[PDB]
Amino acid sequence: VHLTPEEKSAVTALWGKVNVDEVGGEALGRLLVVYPWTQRFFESFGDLSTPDAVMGNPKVKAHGKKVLGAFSDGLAHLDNLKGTFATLSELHCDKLHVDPENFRLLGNVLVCVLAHHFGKEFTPPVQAAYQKVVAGVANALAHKYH
Amino acid sequence: VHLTPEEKSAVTALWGKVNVDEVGGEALGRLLVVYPWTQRFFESFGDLSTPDAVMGNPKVKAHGKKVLGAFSDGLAHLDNLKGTFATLSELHCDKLHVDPENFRLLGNVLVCVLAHHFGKEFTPPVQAAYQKVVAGVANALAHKYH
Amino acid sequence: VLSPADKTNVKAAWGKVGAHAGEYGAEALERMFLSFPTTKTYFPHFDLSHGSAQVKGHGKKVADALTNAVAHVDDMPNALSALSDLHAHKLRVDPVNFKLLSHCLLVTLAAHLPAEFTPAVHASLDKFLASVSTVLTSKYR
Amino acid sequence: VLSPADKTNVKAAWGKVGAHAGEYGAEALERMFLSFPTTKTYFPHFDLSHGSAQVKGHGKKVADALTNAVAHVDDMPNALSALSDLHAHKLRVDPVNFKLLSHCLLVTLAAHLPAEFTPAVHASLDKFLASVSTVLTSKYR
Numbered sequence: 394v395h396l397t398p399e400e401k402s403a404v405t406a407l408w409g410k411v412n413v414d415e416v417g418g419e420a421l422g423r424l425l426v427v428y429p430w431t432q433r434f435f436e437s438f439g440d441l442s443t444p445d446a447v448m449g450n451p452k453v454k455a456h457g458k459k460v461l462g463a464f465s466d467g468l469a470h471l472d473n474l475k476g477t478f479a480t481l482s483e484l485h486c487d488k489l490h491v492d493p494e495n496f497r498l499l500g501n502v503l504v505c506v507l508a509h510h511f512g513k514e515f516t517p518p519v520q521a522a523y524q525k526v527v528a529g530v531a532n533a534l535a536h537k538y539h
Numbered sequence: 540v541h542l543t544p545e546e547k548s549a550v551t552a553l554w555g556k557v558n559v560d561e562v563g564g565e566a567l568g569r570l571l572v573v574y575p576w577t578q579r580f581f582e583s584f585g586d587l588s589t590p591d592a593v594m595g596n597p598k599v600k601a602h603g604k605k606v607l608g609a610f611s612d613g614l615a616h617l618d619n620l621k622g623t624f625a626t627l628s629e630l631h632c633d634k635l636h637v638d639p640e641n642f643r644l645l646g647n648v649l650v651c652v653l654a655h656h657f658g659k660e661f662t663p664p665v666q667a668a669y670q671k672v673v674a675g676v677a678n679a680l681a682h683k684y685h
Numbered sequence: 686v687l688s689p690a691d692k693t694n695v696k697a698a699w700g701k702v703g704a705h706a707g708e709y710g711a712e713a714l715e716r717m718f719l720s721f722p723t724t725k726t727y728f729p730h731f732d733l734s735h736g737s738a739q740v741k742g743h744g745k746k747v748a749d750a751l752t753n754a755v756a757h758v759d760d761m762p763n764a765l766s767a768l769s770d771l772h773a774h775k776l777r778v779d780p781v782n783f784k785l786l787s788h789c790l791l792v793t794l795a796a797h798l799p800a801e802f803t804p805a806v807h808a809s810l811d812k813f814l815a816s817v818s819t820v821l822t823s824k825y826r
Numbered sequence: 827v828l829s830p831a832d833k834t835n836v837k838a839a840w841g842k843v844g845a846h847a848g849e850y851g852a853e854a855l856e857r858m859f860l861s862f863p864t865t866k867t868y869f870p871h872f873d874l875s876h877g878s879a880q881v882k883g884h885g886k887k888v889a890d891a892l893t894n895a896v897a898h899v900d901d902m903p904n905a906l907s908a909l910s911d912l913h914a915h916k917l918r919v920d921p922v923n924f925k926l927l928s929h930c931l932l933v934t935l936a937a938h939l940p941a942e943f944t945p946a947v948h949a950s951l952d953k954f955l956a957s958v959s960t961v962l963t964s965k966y967r
């Protein structure tokens with residue numbers, strides 16, 4: 394996870410405009426609609442029978458916030474993703490057994506969500522900066538599976 | 540890679556019967572035949588147009604011996620597979636840019652080859668121990684992605 | 686997507702497998718549960734001990750499904766519609782698990798066909814299992 | 827395996843790209859090239875700099891191929907067979923790269939068609955690109 398000062402600035406600048414109460418819930422929700430099997434890990438959230446039900450599920454929106462928060466922690470410690478996410482890594486690998494690939498999927502979904510909300514502002518270079526960050530969070534979380 | 544006392548025991552017992560001059564070649568050769576895109580990294584090896592050309596290719600046999608050797612290395616250092624493969628990891632990731640997923644595929648192909656040679660001798664417990672070893676090597680070879 | 690040759694190899698080798706299909710499916714499952722314990726979380730109510738009658742029974746079912754697939758290789762989505770509904774809509778099985786059973790099925794195959802598990806057959810059966818896996822993990826109803 | 831709804835979503839969402847096809851395809855390629863440098867070894871002779879005329883023309887070819895794929899969505903193998911020879915037979919592109927460009931296509935779409943890029947459509951487009959990728963990376967000749 395090596396970001397040039399220029400990317401660090403653009404990533405920080407953009408994230409400043411992110412809606413911390415929504416983006417996370419939208420990304421988690423899209424993860425469950427685009428890759429249906431991920432719902433298996435969240436069967437206690439209630440109704441996930443349809444896209445609209447998933448996107449409108451309170452529990453999905455609430456949990457999304459935490460996810461975004463963690464990503465935020467990461468953006469504040471790109472110097473030590475592995476360390477920042479040591480706890481989550483044990484939760485997802487040792488306790489939940491989520492396959493490492495799903496971490497990558499959620500990461501790309503988030504990138505899709507960001508592109509959706511900022512449109513033309515989410516330029517090719519900015520995306521590149523972000524692909525690095527989500528790749529780091531994922532690899533850090535997969536530390537107990539990698 | 541953990542391998543209980545009984546596991547490491549059986550793993551060793553079986554590898555003792557493995558042909559150092561041919562298995563490597565069979566694994567690499569089947570990799571090229573089952574997953575054709577991997578042929579892209581061996582244009583300097585010669586004819587790989589048919590399964591017979593692949594399995595009979597001298598460079599494939601010769602190179603497979605080196606590969607089988609890296610695995611033998613891993614077996615004698617199951618407690619530090621990361622260190623053991625550090626160099627090969629640099630070669631494969633930073634120099635050749637071989638996507639991590641293929642290390643996993645070659646590893647399972649090796650397992651298939653082992654089952655082909657030992658037949659009934661390759662018991663589920665024996666395989667289970669070997670899946671731990673190939674996942675380790677694979678994760679180790681891709682470590683340049685952390 | 687299977688090639689005309691692929692289809693010929695899959696039919697030939699599965700023909701070779703013949704009456705040992707159910708056993709092989711049972712063994713495949715067993716290797717999967719032992720090699721990738723996580724997969725067990727999908728069969729909580731099953732007796733997964735070595736040689737259990739449930740696993741053997743389930744293997745027969747799996748093999749019959751595959752034999753069915755082999756027989757409708759050119760129209761799998763249609764032929765496996767009910768099974769797809771079960772693994773994709775209902776059980777929502779992660780596709781990584783299909784790679785694992787497939788691998789175990791190939792391993793079992795390698796262990797029983799020292800005379801017929803040629804590289805080409807191996808390649809063809811690999812793609813075949815991938816095609817069955819895609820149908821069963823896809824929701825196309 | 828696409829559902830009738832997937833084809834509905836894909837044809838609808840792709841139809842809004844229309845004359846933008848060339849542009850969007852070029853943007854996806856560029857996004858791919860910057861976000862995943864590795865994908866560049868496939869175009870060693872190409873000028874990949876921002877604004878390249880080559881990248882622009884190529885995306886137009888990629889974009890039209892996808893338009894043709896959407897039209898023959900129920901007959902892809904025969905329809906994209908030539909592209910199959912190309913990517914699977916001649917280029918031997920590692921499947922992983924197809925997931926990368928697909929992701930870049932989705933990102934591009936999301937950034938241009940916010941109203942259309944709904945969860946459901948997002949889901950359908952992804953499966954459509956994965957089916958196209960399967961075909962282009964499979965040797966069924």
Ligand code: HEM
Pocket residue numbers: 431434435437456459460463464481484485489491495496497499500530531534
């Ligand atoms: C991009 C990487 C991801 C990040 C940053 C992340 C972050 C988090 C956080 C912050 C929590 C809650 C922490 C706590 O226990 O207080 C959590 C819990 C959890 N995550 Fe993740 N996660 C990621 C990907 C995934 C994926 C791909 C899955 C599986 C498909 C998953 C499934 C879960 C589940 C099941 C819980 C438990 C929630 C519950 O049932 O109460 N996560 N994650």
Ligand code: HEM
Pocket residue numbers: 577578580581583605606609610627630631635637641642643645646676677680
């Ligand atoms: C996961 C198991 C693998 C192991 C243990 C392994 C081991 C080796 C070893 C020992 C070398 C020789 C280095 C030297 O002699 O200095 C090597 C080179 C190389 N490996 Fe691997 N390898 C693995 C997987 C792969 C895969 C999956 C690919 C890609 C399809 C690959 C492609 C290469 C290439 C291209 C070279 C040789 C380049 C040349 O001589 O032209 N390897 N590997």
Ligand code: HEM
Pocket residue numbers: 724727728746747750751768771772776778782783784786787817818821
């Ligand atoms: C080669 C691909 C597979 C085939 C051909 C296949 C076929 C089948 C068949 C024939 C059944 C019984 C259907 C019935 O109830 O009438 C079944 C059930 C089931 N399969 Fe699969 N399956 C495959 C892969 C998997 C994988 C990868 C998993 C997960 C690790 C899985 C999990 C299950 C479960 C949990 C059941 C239901 C068990 C029960 O409640 O009795 N299957 N499958």
Ligand code: HEM
Pocket residue numbers: 865868869887888889891892909912913917919923924925927928955958959962
């Ligand atoms: C949705 C997926 C894709 C589609 C629809 C697609 C489509 C096309 C089309 C239409 C051509 C033009 C061939 C001609 O005009 O004769 C082509 C060429 C090519 N594609 Fe793809 N492609 C896809 C993914 C990829 C990926 C993932 C790579 C590699 C990272 C790739 C590498 C190439 C290369 C290197 C050429 C040849 C360019 C040259 O050397 O002139 N393609 N593709």
Ligand SMILES: *Cc1ccc(OC)cc1OCc1ccncc1
Pocket residue numbers: 686687761762812815816817818819820827960964
């Ligand atoms: C032919 C083929 C190779 C590899 C994959 O990835 C798992 C999929 C695939 O096709 C699956 C399929 C077969 C028949 N109808 C629809 C889909």
Ligand SMILES: *Cc1ccc(OC)cc1OCc1ccncc1
Pocket residue numbers: 686819823827828902903953956957958960961
């Ligand atoms: C429907 C579908 C989902 C996921 C993948 O990736 C493995 C492929 C796929 O379709 C495969 C296919 C489509 C059309 N014709 C043949 C095969």
